[PDB]
Amino acid sequence: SAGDNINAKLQLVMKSGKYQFGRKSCLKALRTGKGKLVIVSSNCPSIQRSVIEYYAMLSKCGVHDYHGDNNDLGTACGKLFRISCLVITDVGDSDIIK
Amino acid sequence: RMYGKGKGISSSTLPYKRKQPSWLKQKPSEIEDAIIKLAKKGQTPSQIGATLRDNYGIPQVKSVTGNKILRILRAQGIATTIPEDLYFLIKKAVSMRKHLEKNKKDKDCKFRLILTESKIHRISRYYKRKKLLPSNWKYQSSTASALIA
Amino acid sequence: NPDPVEESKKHKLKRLIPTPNSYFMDVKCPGCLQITTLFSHAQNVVLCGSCNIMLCQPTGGKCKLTEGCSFRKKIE
Amino acid sequence: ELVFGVAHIFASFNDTFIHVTDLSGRETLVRITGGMKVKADRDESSPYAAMMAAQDVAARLKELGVTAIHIKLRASGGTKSKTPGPGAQSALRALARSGLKIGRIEDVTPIPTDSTRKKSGRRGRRL
Amino acid sequence: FTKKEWYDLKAPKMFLVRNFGKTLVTKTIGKKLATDSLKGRIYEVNLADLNNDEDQAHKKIKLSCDHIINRDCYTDFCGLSITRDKLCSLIRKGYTLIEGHTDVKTLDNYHLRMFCIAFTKKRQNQTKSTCYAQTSQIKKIRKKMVDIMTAEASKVLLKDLVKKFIPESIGKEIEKQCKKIYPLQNVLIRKVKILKRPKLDISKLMELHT
Amino acid sequence: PKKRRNGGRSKHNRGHVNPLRCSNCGRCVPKDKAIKRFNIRNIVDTSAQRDIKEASVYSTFQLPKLYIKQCYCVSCAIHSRFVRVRSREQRRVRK
Amino acid sequence: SRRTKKVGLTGKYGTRYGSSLRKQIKKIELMQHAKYLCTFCGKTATKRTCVGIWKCKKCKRKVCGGAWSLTTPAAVAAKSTIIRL
RNA sequence: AGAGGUGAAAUUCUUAGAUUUUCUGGAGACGAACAACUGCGAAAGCAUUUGUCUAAAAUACUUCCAUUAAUCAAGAACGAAAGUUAAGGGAGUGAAGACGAUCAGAUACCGUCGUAAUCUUAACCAUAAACUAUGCCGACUAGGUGUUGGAUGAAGUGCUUCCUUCAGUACCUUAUGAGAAAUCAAAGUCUUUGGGUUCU
């Protein structure tokens, strides 16, 4: 159940808190420092994940490597498109921060 | 039992006393507030009642407040669009379908998936016979993975 | 004769009048002097209000409880 | 001074092999069986043949210089049969009576932990 | 034949009798050194006739002829096994038998595969007919016993490993720990097989012979 | 007309049992239907045990035991008299 | 509407060649012309370019694979054994 | 110097060393003894270890929903073995076949060998005495002996047995119950005939 807990927390934040998916939006969120947690799919291209981690470590924001690919991340978010990167602008009443 | 054999009569029987227990000096307003907060934090009503009984010492929420927990959850407007049992059945079917996709030689898992989807269709037929599930709702097996919302 | 039956406690649940076997209690953990309510046949772990310590171990039955404390049935 | 050999005894409802080697199992000292002790094309498994086989091997061992002998009993094989044939009784009897030291006896018949299919169909032998 | 000469067989230091039998080899003629043929043969000998005690008659050691000097062969531990009659006597209907095996290398880089067997006890107040154990308990016992037979066979050398096989210390310890999960009767290392051994070192061979 | 209540075997709450092979004829017979004899026997008769003892040493040598565990089909067991035909009423009695 | 009862893509072959031959070639043309999951971009857009080359229309990245399918069981088994270590 | 094999024999192997002893490597198969009138599964069926995935059942519950249920023509999933197709595998067994015996004959039973098959993968086939020859759901009716998995309470030594209870699973006895009888705790509660339903 190593992925079940994170999927459940993702489902909870998708309902309660506000988020954003997409390389551009997540990059902008990290630039402005409003990002709290960035989820990266296992399928993310190496360059994109590298710039994501560099931005996040600059802005002191956590990065979680998703156990699935971008299809799985989209499904977990409840969308019907690939995602491959996520930024949580704010966490609702979800325990994803710890 | 719906499928298979075995009566399995194990269950929970409510006490004869229908009223709030005398020792309980707790007030229904904070009971409902706690139920709302706990549902917001995110739990299905069954486990909501479970943790309410275990950690708050308030058995049979219907005794403390004169109605049911899903009823107050709806009255607050925050009840989920898919009932608990249907949602759990859909989740289980999705999981076993995902497993089957990798291991298509699992005839037993195929059989159990067929049974689960039969249950899903019967339950959804009942729920849409009631007005609490949209009439066009169908549960095609493709988008059920993201249907969990 | 089944109406005034008196010693049907050993009978399985759902006797002539079905009554649950579970109950509720208060636990006085020694040296902690705290007040809390506890359900027999519980399923979750609990923590005291005064001092954060475990009280009962959730099992398939009436739990294990701690080594000590004074636990009293809170039926009125 | 006591000198030891090893006698593999093979009793399989036919000729009883009497096979004395050294401790290693190589360097066979004498192999007699029961086929050459009876020329009737029968009685190869018989006590009669086993007894002369055993006294013959005992005489040759005495002339060779080995006086103590260990025993390794064997019955047919892993698929044919598990019980030692008629000749094992008389082989041990005659080895005892012939006078040489007899040490340690052990049963070594090959026992399959598997179940490789045996002869005859699922109906078995009809005789 | 008349062209064969006797050879004496010697046993390692930790053993008792140290001279357990004679072996035969043909002449040394041609390219046959009559020592290569003598080298690397296996001797299956009981412990009863090797330590002059009857209570260990159920085990037999395999000694591999490793070195030859003059006229005597010195051999070395090559394997271990219990006898078939004892193994069959240990098995009776009404109890569940536990089987376990593991591969382990010693500090000498001696790769061994060890199989041990156990049986469930009846205790005193059971007043029942069977001593079957749950499959979960079977699994726990097998895991515990694999770990035990691995740890103390891996943190010790081969010579003292054999000298601790001699008193079946492994069984005593496995009981001392498994009393608290399910009572077991006679449990022993059924068999030990040498999977692979390092290059022959005559120095330590003679160190353990002397 | 259903000669035996159990159908001649000991199968319950079960669909299929793996067969073994008769030690005498080799025919396949279901394991629960096969007639099993675990005979524990000496290698030698008592007279030969006396000779083994007197030609042995340690003054305490114990003759080894044979554990064989045969299994037979119905026809082979009946022919070998391991089981009798028995009467209709006596048929119920097992021990 | 449904155009053929069972011949499927082998309808291009008409009545020529044996029925068994047409069925056998159908079974593998079905998977030769299929689209496969591009594990690099996650989009099922990998198509056969030549006999053993598979190109993703999105990634523009190509990969060596089987003659008629992106992967073959013999290759996936070998990769699994290798990655086990 | 025989070895296999048989009720005898023969076919067959064998001074080029068979059978036998010991060791090394490979191969396919199988998974004994434990192993049970035991367990799991809708049935077919399922017994080496470990890991992962997956489901089910019972039990416990002062958790949730609130009639969502039972049985079902059509339709659907699975469906032993054999058989078919294509790759691989191919030890042992072995429909066919070839021999050697027996016999009046023997194309059979017995013996030696042996192709397909048996095994794996991917598809078909959809049948078995696929049998407890007993459709499924529900209620009621009797004692005892067990045994499997939980839960409850107490006592031999933190550990184990006994008590109660649920759910399986058999067995024994008993029927002023049934049946033509064998027998059956269901095949009973049927001329004192109607709980629901499907098939024949």
Tab-separated table of N, CA and C in Angstrom, chain E residues 69-124:
chain	number	residue	atom	x	y	z
E	69	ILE	N	50.289	-38.267	1.387
E	69	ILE	CA	51.726	-38.285	1.611
E	69	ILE	C	52.113	-39.681	2.066
E	70	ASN	N	53.224	-40.182	1.534
E	70	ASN	CA	53.712	-41.516	1.856
E	70	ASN	C	52.673	-42.580	1.537
E	71	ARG	N	51.915	-42.994	2.547
E	71	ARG	CA	51.020	-44.130	2.400
E	71	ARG	C	49.636	-43.874	2.979
E	72	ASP	N	49.403	-42.740	3.630
E	72	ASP	CA	48.132	-42.459	4.275
E	72	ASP	C	47.436	-41.265	3.632
E	73	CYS	N	46.111	-41.351	3.564
E	73	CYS	CA	45.264	-40.298	3.024
E	73	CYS	C	44.648	-39.516	4.172
E	74	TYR	N	44.542	-38.201	4.008
E	74	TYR	CA	44.160	-37.370	5.140
E	74	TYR	C	42.722	-36.876	5.099
E	75	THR	N	42.141	-36.687	3.916
E	75	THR	CA	40.723	-36.361	3.773
E	75	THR	C	40.310	-35.067	4.468
E	76	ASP	N	39.050	-34.684	4.283
E	76	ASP	CA	38.491	-33.480	4.881
E	76	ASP	C	36.975	-33.589	4.826
E	77	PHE	N	36.306	-32.783	5.648
E	77	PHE	CA	34.849	-32.790	5.670
E	77	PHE	C	34.296	-32.457	4.293
E	78	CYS	N	33.331	-33.254	3.841
E	78	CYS	CA	32.803	-33.111	2.492
E	78	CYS	C	31.282	-33.030	2.512
E	79	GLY	N	30.662	-33.572	3.547
E	79	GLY	CA	29.219	-33.514	3.657
E	79	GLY	C	28.759	-34.217	4.912
E	80	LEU	N	27.470	-34.062	5.192
E	80	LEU	CA	26.851	-34.648	6.370
E	80	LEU	C	25.456	-35.127	6.012
E	81	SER	N	25.014	-36.203	6.652
E	81	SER	CA	23.658	-36.683	6.442
E	81	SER	C	23.273	-37.595	7.592
E	82	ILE	N	21.990	-37.582	7.930
E	82	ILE	CA	21.462	-38.525	8.908
E	82	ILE	C	21.019	-39.779	8.172
E	83	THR	N	20.846	-40.865	8.918
E	83	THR	CA	20.578	-42.152	8.296
E	83	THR	C	19.093	-42.336	8.005
E	84	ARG	N	18.817	-43.173	7.003
E	84	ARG	CA	17.456	-43.329	6.506
E	84	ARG	C	16.541	-43.948	7.550
E	85	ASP	N	17.035	-44.930	8.302
E	85	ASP	CA	16.184	-45.575	9.293
E	85	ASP	C	15.736	-44.583	10.356
E	86	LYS	N	16.654	-43.752	10.848
E	86	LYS	CA	16.257	-42.737	11.816
E	86	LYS	C	15.310	-41.725	11.194
E	87	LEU	N	15.589	-41.303	9.960
E	87	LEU	CA	14.724	-40.319	9.321
E	87	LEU	C	13.304	-40.850	9.195
E	88	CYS	N	13.160	-42.111	8.792
E	88	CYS	CA	11.834	-42.697	8.662
E	88	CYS	C	11.179	-42.910	10.018
E	89	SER	N	11.955	-43.294	11.033
E	89	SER	CA	11.383	-43.471	12.361
E	89	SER	C	10.867	-42.159	12.921
E	90	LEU	N	11.473	-41.045	12.526
E	90	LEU	CA	11.059	-39.752	13.048
E	90	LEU	C	9.700	-39.299	12.536
E	91	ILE	N	9.171	-39.925	11.494
E	91	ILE	CA	7.964	-39.458	10.824
E	91	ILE	C	6.815	-40.368	11.226
E	92	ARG	N	5.836	-39.809	11.927
E	92	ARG	CA	4.640	-40.538	12.313
E	92	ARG	C	3.424	-39.691	11.982
E	93	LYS	N	2.343	-40.350	11.583
E	93	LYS	CA	1.119	-39.641	11.248
E	93	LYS	C	0.528	-38.992	12.491
E	94	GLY	N	0.006	-37.782	12.326
E	94	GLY	CA	-0.553	-37.021	13.423
E	94	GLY	C	0.215	-35.770	13.777
E	95	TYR	N	1.409	-35.584	13.229
E	95	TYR	CA	2.199	-34.384	13.447
E	95	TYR	C	2.587	-33.784	12.107
E	96	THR	N	2.754	-32.469	12.091
E	96	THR	CA	3.229	-31.791	10.896
E	96	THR	C	4.744	-31.685	10.940
E	97	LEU	N	5.395	-32.058	9.846
E	97	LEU	CA	6.843	-31.988	9.760
E	97	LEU	C	7.254	-30.724	9.021
E	98	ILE	N	8.291	-30.073	9.533
E	98	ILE	CA	8.790	-28.810	9.013
E	98	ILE	C	10.100	-29.095	8.305
E	99	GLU	N	10.243	-28.592	7.089
E	99	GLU	CA	11.463	-28.781	6.322
E	99	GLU	C	12.007	-27.416	5.947
E	100	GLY	N	13.316	-27.241	6.068
E	100	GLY	CA	13.921	-25.984	5.678
E	100	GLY	C	15.309	-26.214	5.137
E	101	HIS	N	15.723	-25.314	4.257
E	101	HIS	CA	17.041	-25.410	3.658
E	101	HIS	C	17.549	-24.007	3.390
E	102	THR	N	18.868	-23.875	3.390
E	102	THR	CA	19.464	-22.581	3.095
E	102	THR	C	20.861	-22.784	2.540
E	103	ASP	N	21.357	-21.747	1.877
E	103	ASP	CA	22.731	-21.688	1.407
E	103	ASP	C	23.463	-20.612	2.192
E	104	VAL	N	24.675	-20.927	2.630
E	104	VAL	CA	25.428	-20.041	3.509
E	104	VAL	C	26.911	-20.276	3.278
E	105	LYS	N	27.689	-19.200	3.272
E	105	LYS	CA	29.135	-19.296	3.159
E	105	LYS	C	29.782	-18.929	4.486
E	106	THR	N	30.807	-19.686	4.860
E	106	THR	CA	31.545	-19.444	6.086
E	106	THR	C	32.629	-18.398	5.843
E	107	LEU	N	33.383	-18.069	6.896
E	107	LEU	CA	34.505	-17.151	6.725
E	107	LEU	C	35.556	-17.722	5.789
E	108	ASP	N	35.639	-19.043	5.691
E	108	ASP	CA	36.560	-19.686	4.769
E	108	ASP	C	36.071	-19.657	3.334
E	109	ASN	N	34.999	-18.918	3.047
E	109	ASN	CA	34.361	-18.937	1.732
E	109	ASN	C	33.962	-20.357	1.349
E	110	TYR	N	33.462	-21.097	2.328
E	110	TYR	CA	32.982	-22.455	2.134
E	110	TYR	C	31.472	-22.399	1.958
E	111	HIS	N	31.003	-22.654	0.743
E	111	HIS	CA	29.581	-22.579	0.445
E	111	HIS	C	28.919	-23.896	0.818
E	112	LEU	N	27.915	-23.823	1.682
E	112	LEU	CA	27.202	-24.981	2.185
E	112	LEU	C	25.723	-24.802	1.903
E	113	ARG	N	25.025	-25.910	1.695
E	113	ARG	CA	23.572	-25.915	1.686
E	113	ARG	C	23.122	-26.894	2.756
E	114	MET	N	22.357	-26.400	3.717
E	114	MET	CA	21.950	-27.187	4.867
E	114	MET	C	20.439	-27.342	4.888
E	115	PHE	N	20.001	-28.584	5.078
E	115	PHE	CA	18.600	-28.937	5.229
E	115	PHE	C	18.383	-29.456	6.637
E	116	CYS	N	17.437	-28.848	7.341
E	116	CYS	CA	17.041	-29.289	8.665
E	116	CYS	C	15.553	-29.600	8.675
E	117	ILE	N	15.169	-30.475	9.598
E	117	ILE	CA	13.814	-30.993	9.696
E	117	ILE	C	13.379	-30.915	11.150
E	118	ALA	N	12.096	-30.647	11.367
E	118	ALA	CA	11.545	-30.520	12.706
E	118	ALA	C	10.173	-31.169	12.748
E	119	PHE	N	9.702	-31.446	13.957
E	119	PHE	CA	8.381	-32.012	14.164
E	119	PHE	C	7.727	-31.330	15.352
E	120	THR	N	6.401	-31.341	15.366
E	120	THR	CA	5.648	-30.681	16.419
E	120	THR	C	5.418	-31.623	17.593
E	121	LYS	N	5.447	-31.057	18.795
E	121	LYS	CA	5.308	-31.803	20.037
E	121	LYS	C	3.844	-31.946	20.429
E	122	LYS	N	3.596	-32.817	21.403
E	122	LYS	CA	2.242	-33.102	21.853
E	122	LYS	C	1.853	-32.361	23.121
E	123	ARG	N	2.823	-31.792	23.843
E	123	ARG	CA	2.689	-31.319	25.225
E	123	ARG	C	1.851	-32.254	26.100
E	124	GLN	N	1.558	-31.848	27.335
E	124	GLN	CA	1.047	-32.822	28.293
E	124	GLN	C	-0.470	-32.799	28.424
